[PDB]
Amino acid sequence: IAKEEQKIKIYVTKRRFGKLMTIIEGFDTSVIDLKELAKKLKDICACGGTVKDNTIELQGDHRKKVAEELVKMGFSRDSIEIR
Amino acid sequence: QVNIKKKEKWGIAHIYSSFNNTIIHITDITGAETISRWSGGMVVKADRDEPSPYAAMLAARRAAEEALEKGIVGVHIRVRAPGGSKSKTPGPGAQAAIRALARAGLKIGRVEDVTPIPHDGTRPKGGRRGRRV
Amino acid sequence: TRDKWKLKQWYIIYAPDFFGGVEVGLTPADDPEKVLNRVVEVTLKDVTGDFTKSHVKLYFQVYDVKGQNAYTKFKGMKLARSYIRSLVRRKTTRIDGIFNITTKDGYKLRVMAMAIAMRRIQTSQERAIRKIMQEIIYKKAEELNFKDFVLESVNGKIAAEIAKEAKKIYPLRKAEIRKIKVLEEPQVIA
Amino acid sequence: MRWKWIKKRIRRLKRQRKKERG
RNA sequence: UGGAGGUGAUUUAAAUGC
RNA sequence: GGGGGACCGCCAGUGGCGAAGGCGCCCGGCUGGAACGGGUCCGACGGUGAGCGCGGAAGGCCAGGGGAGCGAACCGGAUUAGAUACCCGGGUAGUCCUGGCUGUAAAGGAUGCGGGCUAGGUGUCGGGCGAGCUUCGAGCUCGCCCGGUGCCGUAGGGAAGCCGUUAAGCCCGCCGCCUGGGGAGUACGGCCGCAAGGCUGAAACUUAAAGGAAUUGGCGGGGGAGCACUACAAGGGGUGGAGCGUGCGGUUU
């Protein structure tokens, strides 16, 4: 058990052939597990994806989805910005 | 030097022949004394040229000046390779070394199939559909 | 390392107990007395017929070194991959024939013979060609001296005597001594 | 295919059999 | 003339279309 | 020079043995099956086989012992748009041995077993026989026969591929199983199993197909043969740099 909260920037990005991607950045890499979070998020989006340094990337526009899934998990509605 | 009657020396040359590298290694007829060890990745700078024939002549020419330096003029060549791990068949330095000895001037006696070949089975890597391409 | 060369000693091979002091073999080495058990390969140029021709590769071992002179015994024989692959054929057989020997001199000697079969009908006469080797060999070792008994086997004499008997039973071809290994030296009384 | 199905069937079975066992 | 084995295998050639 | 565990290339065969899973260094002891010559003995004692009983690769599991190489999981690198991979470097269970459990498969010849009948040819393994050869051993060969193991093919069968005296022919005896697809080899119930699981086994609902063989064509990051000059090499010149002419994209109007 722990806590930790962070400022979250979500936005459309760019990958090779195929569609745009969705970046979710600004999580505390000590406390939060981007690999457990991201496995959970690829399930919600239903997209492939990775942990890209300190970010999660999700293939396609998932911007309303993810914020809606992050707030559920007990993250603050007021720390999140969809751009 | 305790008096020599023949006035000719002989140095058996082990030739270890990989598709990743070539090693040439000539010793005395006993094998208890190593004059010289020279491979194919001191000659060059890169991994791709580590084998080939051209490293496997030049490697076999630097050594060949130090065997001339001892008195070794006759050489038997013992061609061999990794057999249990990989495929027994010699790589690009086998046709290369013997060309590298006829140019160096060292005489060529016996040329020999002494490569490790198991009388038996040992499981290498690579299964289900063997090693896959 | 950094031999002038002058930390390099030289010895000379004199290998008897199969022939006289075969002068062949010259030994360089660094320091004194690091070769006293080191093994030398030779074709043997004593008999330039068979011992040069079909008997390529014998191992001799310097049991001692005296005044810087190497005394060398018979340690072993081994044939090259050349031999064994060449001879063998299909729809026939290749056989192999051990015997753990004891001669009257107090040496034990491990032989493996190799004969190649005459075509069809593979059977219990195969192992009986096996049996007629281990019987005849035991009896020649007990009778003959050891130094002699390592001249005969290495020569074709043994391959020849084997064939006469074994062609009565079930005719053979391409019989030989594949390899020999010195089972036990010491003596009859240690 | 039948790989798929066997493990899907197995996972369904287990997970559900987990839910029955519980 | 048509059939069965044993082992090299070749990465220099890129997801999708109602 | 020493120590350890695994295994036994070539041999090796279109080969042999086994009910099946399966089985391969050599030697000896114990032991299963099998062929043939002679039917020498029993005198229908036979077939098949629900239930029932038994054997059953690999993986897994249990307890003990062992552990080289290899290697699920796993740990790194690369690759890649990303790679939970192909490729490479480490690596545990396991792979080995002993005792037990478990009981599954494209466990195939996708072809239950037994008997009789129905052109042939050829190769091969083992046994018999009449000869010739002989190294005087069936060692090298010819042919008939018996048992097995392949391939080719007449009559016939088959939808066709193919099968065709080793039947998928033609008959006679028994046994298992099937009755369109998907739902579903799932639910429930019971039985078995240490566990993992196995054995048995629906219905609601839904569909005008599921499927099989061959034909044609197009296609494949497939192979052979052959050309070409809108091909490429070889070769000569030049476009792309500037100025201008022109047609266009755009913008402006």
Instruction: State the Cα–Cα distance between residues B50 and B40, nearest whole angstrom.
Output: 5
Count CB neighbours of A49 within 10 A. 19
B30 beta carbon to strand F: under 7 Å: no
Instruction: State the Cα–Cα distance between residues C36 and C29, nearest whole angstrom.
Output: 11
Contacts of B9 in chain C (CB under 8 A): 26, 28
Buried b (16+ CB within 10 A) or exposed e, A3-14: eeebebebeeee
Hey, which residues does B25 pair with through a beta bridge?
B14, B37
Instruction: State the Cα–Cα distance between residues C115 and B3, nearest whole angstrom.
Output: 45
B28/C39 CB distance under 8 A = no
Instruction: State the Cα–Cα distance between residues C12 and C145, nearest whole angstrom.
Output: 28
Count CB neighbours of B118 within 10 A. 9
Largest CA distance in chain A: 41
Q: How far is the CA of B123 from the C1' of F99 (A)?
A: 28
- C113 contacts C97 by C-beta, under 8 angstroms: yes
Helix or strand holding residue C166 (H, E):
helix C157-169
Residues 59-118 of B with CB under 7 A from strand F: 85, 117-118
Picking from B5, B12, B112, the nearest residue to C23 by CB comes out as B5
Residue C184: closest CA among C103, C114, C113:
C103
How many helices (H) and strands (E) in chain D?
Answer: 1, 0
Hey, which residues does B72 pair with through a beta bridge?
B9
Which residues have C-beta within 8 Å of that of residue C55, sequence separation ≥ 6?
A: C44, C77, C79, C154
Burial of residue C101 (number of CB atoms within 10 Å: 0-12, 13-18, 19+): buried
Contacts B–C by Cβ distance under 8 A: 58
Whether chain C has a CB inside 8 Å of the CB on B113: the answer is yes
What Å distances lie between residue B81 and B36, B114, C58, C147, CA to CA?
Answer: 19, 9, 22, 36
**Residue found by looking up tokens 């320091």 in the block:** C31
Count CB neighbours of B32 within 10 A. 19
- C88 contacts C176 by C-beta, under 8 angstroms: no
Q: Which CATH superfamily is domain A5-83 in?
A: SUI1-like domain (3.30.780.10)
Hey, which residues does C78 pair with through a beta bridge?
C179
- Name the closest nucleotide to D6, judged by C1' and CA: F185
Q: What does DSSP say about strands C8-14 and C70-78: parallel, antiparallel, or unpaired?
A: parallel
- C176 contacts C55 by C-beta, under 8 angstroms: no
DSSP letter at C97 equals E
Instruction: State the Cα–Cα distance between residues D7 and C107, nearest whole angstrom.
Output: 67
Instruction: State the Cα–Cα distance between residues C109 and C97, nearest whole angstrom.
Output: 13
DSSP C38-58: -EEEE---SSTTHHHHT---E
C39 Cα to chain B: minimum distance (Å): 6
Instruction: State the Cα–Cα distance between residues B100 and C182, nearest whole angstrom.
Output: 38
- C89 contacts C32 by C-beta, under 8 angstroms: no
Largest CA distance in chain C: 67
Q: Which residue of B has its CA nearest to C11?
A: B2
How many helices (H) and strands (E) in chain B?
Answer: 2, 6
Instruction: State the Cα–Cα distance between residues B101 and B75, nearest whole angstrom.
Output: 9
Chain Cα centroid distance, residue B57: 11
- C59 contacts C39 by C-beta, under 8 angstroms: yes
Instruction: State the Cα–Cα distance between residues A27 and A62, nearest whole angstrom.
Output: 18
The token duo for C20 is 């006289």
The token duo for C44 is 């043997």
Instruction: State the Cα–Cα distance between residues B39 and B30, nearest whole angstrom.
Output: 22
Q: What method did the depositors use to determine the structure?
A: cryo-EM
The token duo for C140 is 């020649």
- Helix ranges (H only) for B2-133 are 55-70, 94-104
